[PDB]
Design an enzyme around this catalytic site. Structure first.
Site, PDB file in Angstrom:
ATOM      1  N   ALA B 166      -1.981  -0.018   3.679  1.00  8.65           N
ATOM      2  CA  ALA B 166      -0.611   0.471   3.541  1.00  8.65           C
ATOM      3  C   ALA B 166      -0.591   1.819   2.869  1.00  8.65           C
ATOM      4  O   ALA B 166       0.091   2.689   3.346  1.00  8.65           O
ATOM      5  CB  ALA B 166       0.256  -0.550   2.680  1.00  8.65           C
ATOM      6  N   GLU B 167      -1.342   2.027   1.777  1.00  6.33           N
ATOM      7  CA  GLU B 167      -1.188   3.333   1.116  1.00  6.33           C
ATOM      8  C   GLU B 167      -1.799   4.458   1.945  1.00  6.33           C
ATOM      9  O   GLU B 167      -1.289   5.566   1.967  1.00  6.33           O
ATOM     10  CB  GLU B 167      -1.795   3.345  -0.294  1.00  6.33           C
ATOM     11  CG  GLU B 167      -1.148   2.324  -1.252  1.00  6.33           C
ATOM     12  CD  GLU B 167       0.321   2.617  -1.580  1.00  6.33           C
ATOM     13  OE1 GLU B 167       0.945   3.567  -1.048  1.00  6.33           O
ATOM     14  OE2 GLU B 167       0.870   1.867  -2.422  1.00  6.33           O
ATOM     15  N   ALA B 168      -2.885   4.164   2.623  1.00  4.85           N
ATOM     16  CA  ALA B 168      -3.524   5.159   3.483  1.00  4.85           C
ATOM     17  C   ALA B 168      -2.579   5.444   4.654  1.00  4.85           C
ATOM     18  O   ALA B 168      -2.517   6.564   5.141  1.00  4.85           O
ATOM     19  CB  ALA B 168      -4.870   4.623   4.048  1.00  4.85           C
TER      20      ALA B 168
END
Ligand code: NA
Ligand code: NA
Ligand code: NA
Ligand code: NA
Ligand code: NA
Lengths: 70, 281, 70, 70, 70, 70
Positions: B166-168
């Site tokens: 998700a953060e990538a």
């Protein structure tokens, strides 16, 4: 009276601790310290300021000013 | 929808993220070069999610292949994870609105927040290391996990997986930094304070970037972008702000040809006279 | 009473050092010095404020105001 | 005189409660507390400031400064 | 004790000049003058603040607060 | 001496009237109120601050800090 209305063209902290703003081509100064951040914030954010005062000649003092985001 | 994020190589990993992005978001007209852009997540009903099958932890091998993350599509949060071998969806407590058909749902007492996960994990994201090896360990922890309450190791696994998925997806910066860990040299990715800050400012960034029209810079809280390549090198996907709003209703203020999040400027322009401030104790 | 809730339509520093804000079409002034920059920042970001006072007519004073996240 | 004009390169709060700014490669300090947050806001926003003083030697003091936007 | 940790849901300047923030569903007031702009800046930027006080019931006062970046 | 250089990780006003900031993994405090808005503004805007003191020991006070945008 509405001395000047427009964006602040420049502001300036003065050696006597007053603060000057140039609005619609005229310079006005105020000795009210709390107006310093208020005016600088207006200048930075592009607020329209309306300098109001008994007398309105360039280089005159003021202590009433309206701030509008527009 | 189901997508795979394949950690076999940097190519497979970036390809996987790009494919997800293209399907769930639309590029901003003003922050797009070629097919690399800051994209806005397409509107979807709350509760809409997409599954991410984790693959390639052991490069190109169909091993360690029973983990699926359930990602709420509108905000990219990881709502929970599915052990596809046991057909069990471990869902965070704040995601009871996400229903995955065909699996046994285990509603957890643990919420999805980093505050909670870091606490349960006894692991801070700032300085957190992630390597192919720790993702395998993370995978094993998740597959061994059972229960309605996250354990330390499962929380550490989720922190690592949320970061690299998700953060990538949100931040090309994290995609770029983390992907190095997938190379044959298997270095360690260490999450930086700057990476953490990006993740913490995603909603704010999301509210501001749509207003960008080529200003010389963008300032959102602690985040600064000095040109479009900094924006593109950093952010890939933002929330559809049409957690975008903190307070007020003015996304930005252009100051000296820099686009500022208005709240940020408001937060340093709300000081009274310094002399009065300091003396008025 | 909660007199007005909404964004600040304009703010004004007054000659007597009080500070006026126009909220929900009514002007309110306050002599609380600390509220000046706080109200101006609320104004600049479109923050909803709730002016609370004994009287709610335009021209009323206030010494209490809530800064909302609406 | 106009001692230095340009963006603030760094600002620094000093142990004697004065505040230093580096503008166009020269450092100037001011004992006017009011200028601290105003200079920091100017630095944050890239205002062009003009340090004004009767003495312009780097390292000297000032209490007059103009703030201009682009 | 850490009474509440979360974003400021609203802030309020009170008639007695103290300042209240609502954090994690509870209201806390502080008479510390220095904290007013800081708390409003935290509210504006969504900073997680941690209210620390000897009593944590809503309506308690505090004089200690941490400003985090989450 | 430059004690710590980096963005402010958190800041905290303590009941004993000290203001702590954590920079580059180290905590330092100052009781200069002038520095509270400056430091918090640095914190919320991500300025790089350089805490300077003759005393660089962790948990010690400071009253010299350089601010840089980065
Ligand atoms: Na006049
Ligand atoms: Na692809
Ligand atoms: Na698309
Ligand atoms: Na905003
Ligand atoms: Na001088």
């Amino acid at each position: 009276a509405d001395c000047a209305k427009g964006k602040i063209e420049f502001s300036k902290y003065n050696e006597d601790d007053t603060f000057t703003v140039k609005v619609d081509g005229k310079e006005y100064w105020t000795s009210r310290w709390n107006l310093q951040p208020l005016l600088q914030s207006a200048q930075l954010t592009g607020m329209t300021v309306t300098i109001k005062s008994s007398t309105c000649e360039s280089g005159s003092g003021f202590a009433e000013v309206q701030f509008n985001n527009d | 929808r189901e997508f795979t994020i394949d950690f076999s190589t940097q190519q497979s990993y970036v390809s996987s993220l790009n494919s997800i992005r293209t399907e769930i978001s639309t590029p901003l007209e003003h922050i797009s070069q070629g097919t690399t852009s800051v994209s806005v997540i397409n509107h979807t009903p709350p509760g809409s999610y997409f599954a991410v099958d984790i693959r390639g932890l052991d490069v190109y091998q169909a091993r360690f292949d029973h983990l699926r993350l359930i990602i709420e599509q509108n905000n990219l949060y990881v709502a929970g994870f599915v052990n596809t071998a046991t057909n069990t969806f471990y869902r965070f407590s704040d995601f009871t609105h996400i229903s995955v058909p065909g699996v046994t749902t285990v509603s957890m007492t643990t919420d999805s927040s980093y505050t909670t996960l870091q606490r349960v994990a006894a692991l801070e994201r700032s300085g957190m290391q992630i390597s192919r090896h720790s993702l395998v360990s993370s995978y094993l922890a998740l597959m061994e996990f059972s229960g309605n309450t996250m354990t330390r190791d499962a929380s550490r696994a989720v922190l690592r997986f949320v970061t690299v998925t998700a953060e990538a997806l949100r931040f090309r910066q994290i995609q770029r930094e983390f992907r190095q860990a997938l190379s044959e040299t298997a270095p360690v990715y260490t999450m930086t304070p700057g990476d953490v800050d990006l993740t913490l400012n995603w909603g704010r960034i999301s509210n501001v970037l749509p207003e960008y029209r080529g200003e010389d810079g963008v300032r959102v809280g602690r985040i600064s972008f000095n040109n479009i390549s900094a924006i593109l090198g950093t952010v890939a996907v933002i929330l559809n702000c049409h957690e975008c709003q903190i307070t007020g209703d003015r996304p930005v203020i252009k100051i000296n040809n820099t686009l500022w999040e208005s709240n940020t400027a408001a937060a340093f322009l709300n000081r009274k006279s310094q002399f009065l401030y300091t003396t008025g104790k």
